[PDB]
Design a binder for this molecule. Structure first.
Ligand SMILES: CCc1c(-c2csc(CN3CCC(N)CC3)n2)[nH]c(C)c1C(C)=O
Ligand SMILES: CCc1c(-c2csc(CN3CCC(N)CC3)n2)[nH]c(C)c1C(C)=O
Length: 105
């Protein structure tokens, strides 16, 4: 299970999930809604996957948590055009994440 020293990450993730721009990223990208995603994106990531990994002890360090957060946003900008609704949401969420991370680092 998660070590208590990572509680600050648990909180950041909770706040990200609650953000107005988080809706694209809550669950894995869904093949029922778009084709050819895993064809291009080799390491899919989403906030529910992160939440369960963090709670079960799958992240030893805050750096691993942050790398998965950035992977969400990196995948988003790889797959989606900046002008799309999902693309714009990824940019909002990256800024929000970086602002919360910078309080600690
Ligand atoms: C399919 C487009 C997409 C969504 C997306 C579209 S709709 C949604 C949330 N939506 C809520 C209602 C549920 N019934 C189904 C899922 N996420 N997200 C991401 C990260 C996408 C891509 C291609 O990068
Ligand atoms: C979440 C609804 C949805 C969208 C979608 C994309 S864009 C949009 C409207 N809208 C614009 C501004 C945002 N702040 C919130 C959502 N709904 N696509 C798909 C395939 C959906 C489902 C039900 O599967």
């Amino acid at each position: 299970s998660m070590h208590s020293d990572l509680t600050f990450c648990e909180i950041i993730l909770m706040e990200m999930e609650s953000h107005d721009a988080a809706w694209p990223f809550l669950e894995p990208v869904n093949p029922r809604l778009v084709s050819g995603y895993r064809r291009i994106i080799k390491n899919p990531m989403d906030f529910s996957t992160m939440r369960h990994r963090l709670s079960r002890g799958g992240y030893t360090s805050s750096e691993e948590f942050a790398a998965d957060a950035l992977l969400v946003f990196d995948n988003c900008q790889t797959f989606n055009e900046d002008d799309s609704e999902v693309g714009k949401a990824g940019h909002i969420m990256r800024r929000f994440f970086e602002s919360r991370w910078e309080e600690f680092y």
